[PDB]
Amino acid sequence: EKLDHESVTQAMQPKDTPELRALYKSFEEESIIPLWTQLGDLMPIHPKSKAVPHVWKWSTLLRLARKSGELVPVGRGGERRALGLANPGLGGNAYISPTMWAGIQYLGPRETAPEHRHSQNAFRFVVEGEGVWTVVNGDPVRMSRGDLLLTPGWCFHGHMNDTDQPMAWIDGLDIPFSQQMDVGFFEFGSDRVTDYATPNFSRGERLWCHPGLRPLSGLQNTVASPIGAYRWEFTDRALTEQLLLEDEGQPATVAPGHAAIRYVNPTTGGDVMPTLRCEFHRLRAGTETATRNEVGSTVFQVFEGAGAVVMNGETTKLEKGDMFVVPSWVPWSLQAETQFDLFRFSDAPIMEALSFMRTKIEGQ
Amino acid sequence: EKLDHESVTQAMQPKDTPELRALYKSFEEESIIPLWTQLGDLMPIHPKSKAVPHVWKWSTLLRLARKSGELVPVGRGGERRALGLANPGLGGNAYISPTMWAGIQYLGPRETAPEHRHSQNAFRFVVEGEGVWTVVNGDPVRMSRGDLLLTPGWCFHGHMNDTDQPMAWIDGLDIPFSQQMDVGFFEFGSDRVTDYATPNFSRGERLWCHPGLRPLSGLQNTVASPIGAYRWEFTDRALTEQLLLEDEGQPATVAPGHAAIRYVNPTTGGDVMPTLRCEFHRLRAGTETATRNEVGSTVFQVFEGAGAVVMNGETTKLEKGDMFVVPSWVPWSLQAETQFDLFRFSDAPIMEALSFMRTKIEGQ
Amino acid sequence: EKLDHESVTQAMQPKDTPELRALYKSFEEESIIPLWTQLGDLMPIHPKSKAVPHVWKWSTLLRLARKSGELVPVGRGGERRALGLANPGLGGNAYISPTMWAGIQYLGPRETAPEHRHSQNAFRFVVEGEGVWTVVNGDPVRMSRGDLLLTPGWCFHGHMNDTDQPMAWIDGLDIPFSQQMDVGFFEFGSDRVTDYATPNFSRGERLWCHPGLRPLSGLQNTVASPIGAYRWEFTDRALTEQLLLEDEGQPATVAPGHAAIRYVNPTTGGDVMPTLRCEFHRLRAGTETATRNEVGSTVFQVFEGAGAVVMNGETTKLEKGDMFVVPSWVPWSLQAETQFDLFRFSDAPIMEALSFMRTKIEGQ
Amino acid sequence: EKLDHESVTQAMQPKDTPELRALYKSFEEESIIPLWTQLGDLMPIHPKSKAVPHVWKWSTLLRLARKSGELVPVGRGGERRALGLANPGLGGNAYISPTMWAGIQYLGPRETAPEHRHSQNAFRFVVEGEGVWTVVNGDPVRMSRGDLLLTPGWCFHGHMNDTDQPMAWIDGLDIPFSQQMDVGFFEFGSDRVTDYATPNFSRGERLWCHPGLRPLSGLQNTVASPIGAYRWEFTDRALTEQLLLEDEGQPATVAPGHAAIRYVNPTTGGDVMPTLRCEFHRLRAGTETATRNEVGSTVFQVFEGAGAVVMNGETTKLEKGDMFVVPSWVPWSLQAETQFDLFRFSDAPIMEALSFMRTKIEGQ
Ligand SMILES: O=C(O)c1ccccc1O
Ligand SMILES: O=C(O)c1ccccc1O
Ligand SMILES: O=C(O)c1ccccc1O
Ligand SMILES: O=C(O)c1ccccc1O
Ligand SMILES: [Fe+2]
Ligand SMILES: [Fe+2]
Ligand SMILES: [Fe+2]
Ligand SMILES: [Fe+2]
């Protein structure tokens, strides 16, 4: 039980003879690899990701995105002026974790990013800015500060800046999962967006964003949320109410001074998309979360306030827009200096769907 | 296939002899009843309810409720000054249909209706009035015009009029189902309500009424909705948006000029309670719905405007507050003279859960 | 909490005046019934069925069925020479409980019972006999001692005696539920059965009765089991193995000396049909089950051995073939004198689907 | 729509200036990778696995396994004398596909392989041999020709040869998925097996292998099958019956002359384990399956008879024991020369759980 791969007796060490070396040589020629030389690496005691905890500064991401807006035109082929966060441990792949892409995207004055679709699921999140509409299956969706915008797999999407000012946001996708697992399909759509209109609220929201109500034309459940925009207003109100209810001595917050919501598919009560979980957390000044180990990877973006993250015992100070990744089973906690708002995403739906999820919480 | 119980050959007619009569007599003594004398009644070609279509006028219901407020005190024992709509076909039982109670309730100035709970599921709907709070598991819930209020089975509930003016509403319960099926439990609670405070919005709403958002403290799914109030604002907005989207040529309405929503449990996307489905319909002036036959019973209350219902080919003119029941498989349609808003409930979740549901729609 | 409808203060007793009597008279004229005169009956503290516990002797059921085979021809119209057990508490209805029909059926030498279908779900169980095939959607299904045969709602079924000797079995249906709830449809099929062949095993069994295996042509889940026959061999083997595993000190039996199985839909792991649960119990000699209160009704048939049932504290000695009903919430236990085998059915799937199920077990 | 990554206009080619090269250099320093240089590789038109179709000959696998039994002792540390099939396209990883390990394992006379558990799900399949018991959570499970044995994640398992003759089998696991996704946990158990007894049938089978029957002590559904052994008898009988039913003109086979089953979890009707689907196929002599493209990877082992596989248009002749892998979206078909039996496994449950599954069938 307490034994690990370092301390266990190694009882399968063959005698090193010419017959043994010839056996190993013939394994190579036959595309055979023995378990007994490999076991501890293939099957660790607990997860040990090649990805490392890492933090990217928003100020740095903005500088690089802005310079890219100056030097690189957006359009067909390359599709998006998007910069992926590449984990230092992941071999030069544009993967923030083994399952997820997280990237900054920049659309300059009056630019269009052309329409396409792909089996890969996607969302947009906005720490700051306005001006862009993303048109999802023909339905123009305004992008504003604090909004989560969804683009489920196989939905046509294109983006356009309707103003004379640049805008930046983050993209999350299951690109790394999808590449390694061979589930990717892609289709080019129109070179412009199919609708340039700029309504305040999308058709999706107009049908689906009334609490506890479901259109009779929408009684079929969906694999992904039909809500195209989870607007900041509602997120802000939800979190405030939780802290207000806590004041009044009423259950609501997930832990003391820790308000939090999960963005959900309203047809099921489940996650927004099959591979991706999105959450939003608001911590009271002075709140320190209990340290968690969780299977699978998570990424946060600081939306507002000041604080720190601790990963593997290491404290990193965080500011507005900063992004960090916690790989599988890395102990993590957040510490709020001011009231501390963060946007969160993860691959937890994959882990939970396949019964791989485990959680260790300090004090429990 | 085209044969029915009237036209089929009756091939089990025994010879009427003293031996046969002695056999039938001994069936009675042994508590045995033969199928062959009974078949057509026990197993009809299509449903043939003992309940009949029937309409009750709100003006009449109000008169009787008001007089009851003058002559009958509310309190313990009797519990509620509630008048049940009793279907003429249902043998003197206080059943609007074989599954459902529908009733008018009246609470006068400053009165309290004391706390209790029961396995029977319940909701309140308000065509008109204000002043009452219903306190559900200690959580005061304001009752206003156009609101649906829920009281799932086994939740403690009491009601109090916080003003000097009377209020009336309708109650729906699965009382008849629960009586006939032997599932009823009941417990007396406090003689007053446990909280006299009168907040604008309940704790339940404050956690659960933000579209597409779920508290992390509420990740467990519930058998009934945790939303205690489905406020008129949202219902009205939903219905308007559907008619607006229809104008713009966009799918939304369930049929031409027919906007409609289903009130739902946000943890599942399903019905508010296991036995009871609630809906709200808004018809454009001049809309006539396609005639439907549906398994199980439904009840409507006219919330606003003027129109008619047709049941079994018979037109009945309807006004604000009027209530009608459509028993199982009775052909029904609605005709809007002005824009015509109706609140709807039914036992459809029971039928659908047990795979008994069938639907015939005229033109399909 | 400890108050009941007998001991609670009755605080809604109006003054008995001509104005009050005129109010009550006008309730009658308007088809209105007040809650306050009715409450305790409509909403009891715990279930109080109109059905009573009752036992029918197989010797008596056989005598009556045999005499019916002499005096009453089987055929069209009457459809089946079936005798329903009619609960003394259920008003002359051919209902063994408020939800279920339980009946003895008799098919004499060479007789055919013609084909039909109905939304009502059905099963056959055989304490004794052979010779009959029931043809279900064209698929001949042999009927033998100890077999459970299924006939899910809307499946065409007819029965024929292929021998010169009579056979009797029991039928269970959701007839009473279906009548009271208005879900019944019925269709006459062919006057004879569509296939007179008499294979040992049906096509359904040949596809579906291999443990842990599912045909690739059957990947769609079904609302009812596609297994047409649950043969005695497997039931007997299952129960024996549980008692053997218990001997070996291994978990298997549901309680000490109490082996039991539930017949299941193999596509879901759930109940055989939406309204009806079937089980088979085998008790070691000397086993006495802990007393249970359960919501909803259950019926047993003694298949073999000798024992007793206790209901409401009353012991009734039982022999092979005897049948008894336990209405909702009646305390019940079984006592085995010899090894005691019983077939069981109930309306528990209805109760569980609608979250009405409760269970009290003595000692827990 | 018809455009691909080769033929699309590349409109994001920046001017190659020192400012651009400095921008790209600073991307490297900041752990940023741009989408626009990467798009076509990250997001292909359809899947394009690094894994290639490949076939391994059983004669070759046996030779290498036998020599390993001579030169390499089995025991602690290395754990298993197992040889993994390593796809030539997968970079030297011991992965037959991106999701699955498939390997030959060899246990010589009287040897024990010691107990352990791991989150990785596993099964054993036997083309030939007898003598080994695998003890799963203390429950000895006989291993015989044609049997599928399961070892769901986190179950303690060890293996022992109870005879004087060697035995070989194949192992399938979700090792590659689990490594790349960081879900692996591992625990060492006892150095020997905890029970050396050698019963014909395990406790799991004795509870769970009776068709359509479920123990009342097992009403809780499981994430993986509780059946530890899917014995050849039942698999053989199922397949025969399908071909017999086809002869009789009755629906059963999945395609003409193509009998097939899926091994299932009896508590749900679903797959044996969350990550792994197992099937068994029997083709009539002369049957050629319609060509399929399927998302995700599959592996077959020829159990009996002679035939061929076609992958990417290439025919490879197959004999008893031979193994082949079809990576994601590779067109594949089987051709039977004699009656042709194959065991199949795949990662299809992962694809279906996450809504990534697509299927193209030739002629449909
Ligand atoms: O569609 C996008 O905006 C996008 C952004 C980043 C990565 C892949 C994408 O398709
Ligand atoms: O609780 C109520 O207000 C009520 C109203 C009508 C019928 C039964 C009830 O419990
Ligand atoms: O089909 C039958 O055999 C039957 C038996 C009893 C009651 C109703 C029925 O349809
Ligand atoms: O337990 C096994 O036999 C085994 C076999 C191959 C790979 C990993 C394993 O744990
Ligand atoms: Fe995209
Ligand atoms: Fe009540
Ligand atoms: Fe019938
Ligand atoms: Fe293992």
Structure description:
Four copies of one chain form a homotetramer. By secondary structure, chain A is α+β, with helices and mostly antiparallel strands. Chain A has a single domain (17-364), classed as Sandwich (Jelly Rolls). Helix content of chain A is 18%, strand content 31%. Chain A contains seven helices and 24 strands. Chain A has helices spanning 18-30, 39-42, 58-71, 175-181, 203-208, 232-247, 348-353, and strands at 32-34, 54-56, 82-85, 101-107, 112-118, 122-125, 132-136, 139-142, 148-151, 157-161, 167-173, 186-188, 213-215, 229-230, 258-263, 277-283, 292-294, 298-304, 307-311, 314-318, 323-326, 332-336, 340-346, 359-361. Chain A has a six-stranded antiparallel beta sheet. In chain A, β19 and β20 form a beta hairpin. The longest helix of chain A has 16 residues, at 232-247. Chain A is globular. Chains in contact: A-B, A-D, B-C, C-D. Chains B and C meet through α1, β1, α3, β3 and α4 of B and α1, β1, α3, β3 and α4 of C. β13 of chain A pairs antiparallel with β15 (258-263) of chain B, so a sheet runs across the interface. One 2-hydroxybenzoic acid binds next to β4 and β11 of chain D. Residues 80, 82, 101, 103, 105, 122, 157, 171, 173 of chain A line the site of one 2-hydroxybenzoic acid.
